[PDB]
Design a protein around this nucleic acid. Structure first.
Ligand SMILES: Nc1nc2c(ncn2[C@@H]2O[C@H](COP(=O)(O)OP(=O)(O)O)[C@@H](O)[C@H]2O)c(=O)[nH]1
Ligand SMILES: *C(=O)[C@@H](N)Cc1ccccc1
Lengths: 82, 85, 61, 205, 375
RNA sequence: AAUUGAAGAGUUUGAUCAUGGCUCAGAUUGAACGCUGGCGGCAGGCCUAACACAUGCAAGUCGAACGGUAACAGGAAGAAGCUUGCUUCUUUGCUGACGAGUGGCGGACGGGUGAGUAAUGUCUGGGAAACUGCCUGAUGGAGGGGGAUAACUACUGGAAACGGUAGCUAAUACCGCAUAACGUCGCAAGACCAAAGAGGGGGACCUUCGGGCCUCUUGCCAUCGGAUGUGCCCAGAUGGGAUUAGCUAGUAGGUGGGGUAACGGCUCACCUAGGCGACGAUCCCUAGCUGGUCUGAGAGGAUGACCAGCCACACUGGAACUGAGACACGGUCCAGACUCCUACGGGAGGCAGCAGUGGGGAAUAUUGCACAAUGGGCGCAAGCCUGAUGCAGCCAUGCCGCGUGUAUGAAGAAGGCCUUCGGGUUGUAAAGUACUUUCAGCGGGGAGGAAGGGAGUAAAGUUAAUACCUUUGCUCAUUGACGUUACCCGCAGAAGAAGCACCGGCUAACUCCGUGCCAGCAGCCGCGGUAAUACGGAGGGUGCAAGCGUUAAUCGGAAUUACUGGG
RNA sequence: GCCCGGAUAGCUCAGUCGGUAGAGCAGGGGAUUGAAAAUCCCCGUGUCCUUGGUUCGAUUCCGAGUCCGGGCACCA
């Protein structure tokens, strides 16, 4: 099973989630096939904080890979249409 | 050990007594074919073949064999009787 | 065998101590220093300068 | 962090008015300058090469009020920049907030200027900055927070800047006690007597 | 809250336990607090202190100004192993004297045992005043106690004696109920967590558990407590308290508890030291002590001592011997003096003013002392 | 924008140039110790005993798989108090849910240690003789029967552990039949092989009145795929010793049989007699490997803590089953060692999981909080479990930031110290005086980490249907361990916060007195023999800073292993 | 917690079954020399660990504690 989950990085009280394509039978920050963008939930009023290249994502889900609910909800936030 | 996953202990013993009993009958059907090949009776083994050909193939779909091991059996066993006939 | 430094010590046949290396090039064979102020070896008396070595505490008064 | 000791004695170590005690009385004259480093200060120092190289470095540290590890951290910054190491150090050291406010004239002495910065009185970009080691970026404006504005200290200090230099790599308003930092300084316009050439090879070893 | 240990002494069956059941109830209703039943005080659970089986009930009564932890023994021999060995000590005792029996020989032994261990104050409670209701016989019982105190070196000429009836204070009759308040009032007028080290136990798997009954204050599981020992003092915390292998969330005043430390060996703590409050007392290498010397017929000595004489001081749980310096003016100190002596003990420990002890030397109790001045 | 970068000095000698070792100045450390000590931010903290271990907890879950319901809460029938429906309350699986049992799934993940391993491993680059649950793509099927077993009862052995005897019933449990395909065995013809039903809603119809029937969601069987994982093979590379020189006889290859998912000496029978070996076999010693870390101008040298991938191990040794996957940390069987219970016949147990204890050792932390978040497990979901993880506690262990205040202040004091006793120095230092206040401490406000989920409603699809279900918005109440948070404001007062090494040269910075080859100093050269800038105290100065020194360790300097770069 | 052995001038030991403490190795003080070797001339420098008892009198007798090493427990 291949998933599109996250990866807790950063520090104590200062997270930085790496939206990553990995396997479900491994560690959170373990073996991953690729990191498709990143996510900053502790962001500011700057010009960034979320990057997700849809093409790489769709190529994985189209194969049979599952997506994490957190990422999918944020995918509705990244709005593929608008 | 003190763990509710000790049912897998009694599950396996129920399964090993079951599975091996099936494997023993699976093997003896193979042995029966070798008796005729030893005596050289091309007619007996042919019948003995189709006697349990479905049997060894039956454990394949059951999940007992890796299905390729079972297929390998039907290949060489035929090779012996065609060598004889 | 180690070198017991200090002005008047209190080591008698036993009492566990600590050994730190370092030759003195004054005695044939020795290669260590018994640390003053460790486990049983008390601090040397009347020493007001350089007390990190010799294990003397800071004078209370 | 700080030295907090007789901060005029070390000026006698080198025999130069390092502005450590500007205050309100401009000219001191009663400190026995140039002839009171220690007790037997009448003797002439042997002054070896390692000694002349050290004093050059030791002069500036007592001037900005930083320490060795702080300085070695600063020098390492100068190594990883193009152009020239000699100027990379001095351009960096002017980036100190307590130096900037001192150069603006809002601080009599750097020691006094360091205190207003550390006590949230200073405000850059409308933001309160506590750490004096704040490397100010070019083209930025600083100001004094309103509650801590004109609390008698900056008032006396502002007029004392009228016996000063009034540099060119920065700009002041002095109408609402506002100062704006321009581009980073060049060597040619900073005191003209502090040699950075001797500093560089000391940290090579 | 300041705390003083108190106990009821005297002849058995005079009214000690019911008086103990009288003060615990009178201070719990009119002032507030928890009350202990009489049968709960009459029956005492067992405890093993220094290897001796001791049955002592630990009840408590609270006064608006003072905190009290009471001890009791339904057997005279149990009272014997209390004060001398170092189990139970009171700064002020409540001498229970029945008006129908007066000063009994057993009452005379409790007056005697107060001398040796060093009990400075003794409040007297004349009990059984509900039988002898005449003025003449009630004052003959008063002078016999006072003569038994004055002969035994006690300030019997100015001690407040409370005439009362203990059993009448149980049902709640106001006439004798308020008199116990006069008794409780006399406990305050006339008469800081600290813990002695009676025995240590390296509980297998848990760590080092020090045993000892609570001297003063209340402690819970988790407080940072310091320990003053005959070494350089250290800091730790009480990660647990159990009593006879029975869980206990709080270690209160009077209860024989078991404190569990935070990372300490058996060699770090030796029996005799003390766990005190982090910030009250520091150890001293020098101090002054006031002592009273017995005579040859009550133990003591028969030959005097000189300079350099080092007797074994027994302060609550410690057998520390110390070379004693004598005051100027005296050379030979004969058995029977009441002079002060200078102490330079071999190993520093928390020695504040007021600490009582019974001096020994060779194997017999020589005298009773109290720290006069800390140096 | 992407390595702008390399130092020396002391000591052979009467003196000198070389050769040549020894040593020191630097950086660093998973650190330890000594002294001292104000706080905070982020990491890190058992390297020796892979030493033995008390207790708590660390993997369970699903009623939408099934018989049941021992318990808790309702419904319903009934029954008793007596206020006649206010209560009391015996039956009852009829619902919600649920101990224990059968079953599917997980338990092979996650987490810890480094004993073993010198090549069966790892790293690098290729390869074909394979397999691959969960997830996903495409195409068909999913028809029909039978008999046991646990729970549950009766009886019964045993201290317990732990079973036994005669019977009961069902199922997505199990076993046959039917039907086969581009699937499998075969040159072909032919032969042979699969399975399982549940949940919600409801119209006509239909009700042996259980339910069928239509439909929605999901699961089951087979095949070729795909993604992913896993296994196997070759080549290169991956420590030291030749005072280790011959090693090997299932060993080198072949044929055949058998076995393995798959090729194979993987294993056997027979034939042949070869195979490895100086560009190092075997043997012995040591040892987890790499991406990296430290030093170094580089090349290289040393090293492999934390993190990440991999292999190995799970008290010792061995074996095997189950299963997609283990030949398995919290699984089984056996031998052995060490503990534990014992009713002495017999059984029970493995902290190198997080804490913790004994002991070891120079030395390395709480038997904490919560599942809010991320991930994982099961489940339709809700949820439940989660010592993974997220946090808190402990320590100056490291990197980093900040404070211990500022300005003013000359009889240029007292006192200390030196003095040619004039004075100088301590010293703008302090006192005195005028202001401000980070962080401590006290008292109130207050981010953000929170995405969703649950219920409701409208719309759009699904359908016979406005239902059910699914999806896109929206409304209500909201879910936060940390947490007396980050941050902000107010109040009082300089109030609560500075030691450590050193001062002959190398190497930055001095005298006096005391001790007199004594005591001690010491890295090296070297000090001390009665006037010591080197011993000890004291004043002063210097270096650094909440750290300063010391020892050990590694590299550098060492071009004293020299390929760059020597003789 | 309890039971013994060492605690004898710098060091190692004799002496006791009460009678005013020894020896050996020492080391040092003086004369010589620039300072010592060598030679000559003189040597206890002791609280018998401390303390108390049985006292004409205790190192030695009975007692205790403390320090050190060696054996046994006990497990809030
Ligand atoms: N007459 C009378 N008897 C009393 C009084 N106080 C106590 N007692 C009696 O003393 C007896 C025991 O008293 P207590 O102190 O419990 O004795 P203990 O527990 O055995 O030492 C009881 O039986 C009471 O009757 C009193 O005031 N008057
Ligand atoms: C442990 O039980 C202590 N709280 C009390 C105790 C009992 C027996 C012996 C020693 C202490």
């Amino acid at each position: 099973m291949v998933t599109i989950r996250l990866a807790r990085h950063g520090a104590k009280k200062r997270p930085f989630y790496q939206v990553v394509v990995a396997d479900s039978r491994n560690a959170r920050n373990g073996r991953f096939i690729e990191r498709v963008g990143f996510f900053n939930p502790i962001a500011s009023e700057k010009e960034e904080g979320t990057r997700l290249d849809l093409d790489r994502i769709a190529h994985w889900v189209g194969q049979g890979a599952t997506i994490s609910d957190r990422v999918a909800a944020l995918i509705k936030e990244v709005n593929k249409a608008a | 050990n003190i763990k509710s996953a000790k049912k897998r202990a009694i599950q396996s013993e129920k399964a090993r007594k079951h599975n091996a009993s099936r494997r023993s009958m699976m093997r003896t059907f193979i042995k029966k074919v070798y008796a005729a090949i030893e005596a050289g009776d091309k007619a007996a083994a042919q019948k003995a073949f189709n006697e349990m050909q479905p049997i060894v193939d039956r454990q394949a779909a059951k999940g007992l064999i890796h299905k390729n091991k079972a297929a390998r059996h039907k290949a060489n066993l035929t090779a012996q009787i065609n060598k004889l006939a | 065998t180690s070198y017991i430094g200090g002005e008047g010590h209190n080591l008698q046949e036993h009492s566990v101590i600590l050994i730190r290396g370092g030759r003195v090039k004054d005695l044939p064979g020795v290669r260590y220093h018994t640390v003053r102020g460790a486990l049983d070896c008390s601090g040397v008396k009347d020493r007001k300068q350089a007390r990190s070595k010799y294990g003397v505490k800071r004078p209370k008064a | 962090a700080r030295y907090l000791g007789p901060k005029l004695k070390l000026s006698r170590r080198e025999g130069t008015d390092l502005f450590l005690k500007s205050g309100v009385r401009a000219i001191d004259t009663k400190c026995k300058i140039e002839q009171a480093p220690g007790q037997h200060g009448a003797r002439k120092p042997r002054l070896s090469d390692y000694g002349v190289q050290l004093r050059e470095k030791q002069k500036v540290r007592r001037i900005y009020g930083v320490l060795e590890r702080q300085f070695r951290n600063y020098y390492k910054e100068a190594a990883r920049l193009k152009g020239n190491t000699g100027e990379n150090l001095l351009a960096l050291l002017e980036g100190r907030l307590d130096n900037v406010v001192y150069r603006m004239g809002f601080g009599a002495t750097r020691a006094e200027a360091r205190q207003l910065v550390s006590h949230k009185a200073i405000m850059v970009n409308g933001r309160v900055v506590n750490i004096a080691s704040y490397q100010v970026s070019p083209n930025d404006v600083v100001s004094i927070r309103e509650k801590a504005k004109k609390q008698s200290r900056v008032k006396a200090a502002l007029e004392l800047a009228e016996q000063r230099e009034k540099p060119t790599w920065l700009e002041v308003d002095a109408g609402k006690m506002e100062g704006t930092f321009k581009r980073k300084p060049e060597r040619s316009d900073l005191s003209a007597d502090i040699n950075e050439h001797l500093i560089v090879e000391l940290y090579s070893k | 809250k300041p705390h003083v240990n108190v106990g009821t002494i005297g002849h058995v069956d005079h009214g000690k336990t019911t008086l103990t059941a009288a003060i615990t109830t009178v201070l719990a209703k009119t002032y507030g607090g928890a009350a202990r039943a009489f049968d709960q005080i009459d029956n005492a659970p067992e405890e093993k202190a220094r290897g001796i089986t001791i049955n002592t009930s630990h009840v408590e009564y609270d006064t608006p100004t003072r905190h009290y932890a009471h001890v009791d023994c339904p057997g005279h021999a149990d009272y014997v192993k209390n004060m001398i060995t170092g189990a139970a000590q009171m700064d002020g005792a409540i001498l229970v004297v029945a008006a129908t029996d007066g000063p009994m020989p057993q009452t005379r032994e409790h007056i005697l045992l107060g001398r040796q261990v060093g009990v400075p104050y003794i409040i007297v409670f004349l009990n059984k005043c509900d039988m002898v209701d005449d003025e003449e016989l009630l004052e003959l019982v008063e002078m016999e106690v006072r003569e038994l105190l004055s002969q035994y070196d006690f300030p019997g000429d100015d001690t407040p004696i409370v005439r009362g009836s203990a059993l009448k204070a149980l049902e709640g009759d106001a006439e004798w109920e308020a008199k116990i308040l006069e008794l409780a009032g006399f406990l305050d007028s006339y008469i800081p967590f600290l813990l002695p080290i009676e025995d240590v136990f390296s509980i297998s798997g848990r760590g080092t558990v020090v045993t000892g009954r609570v001297e003063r204050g209340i402690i819970k599981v988790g407080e940072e407590v310091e320990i003053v020992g005959i070494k350089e003092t250290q800091k730790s915390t009480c990660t647990g308290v159990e009593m006879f292998r029975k869980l206990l969330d709080e270690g209160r005043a009077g209860e024989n508890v078991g404190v569990l430390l935070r990372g300490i060996k058996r060699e770090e703590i030796e029996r005799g030291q003390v766990l005190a409050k982090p910030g009250t007392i520091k150890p001293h290498t020098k101090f002054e002590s006031e002592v009273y010397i017995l005579s040859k017929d009550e133990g003591g000595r028969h030959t005097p001592f000189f300079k350099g004489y080092r007797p074994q001081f027994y302060f609550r749980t410690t057998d520390v011997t110390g070379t004693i310096e004598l005051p100027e003016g005296v050379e030979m100190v004969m058995p029977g003096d009441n002079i002060k002596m200078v102490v330079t003990l071999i190993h520093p420990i928390a020695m504040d003013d007021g600490l009582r002890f019974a001096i020994r030397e060779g194997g017999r109790t020589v005298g009773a002392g109290v720290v006069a001045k800390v140096l």
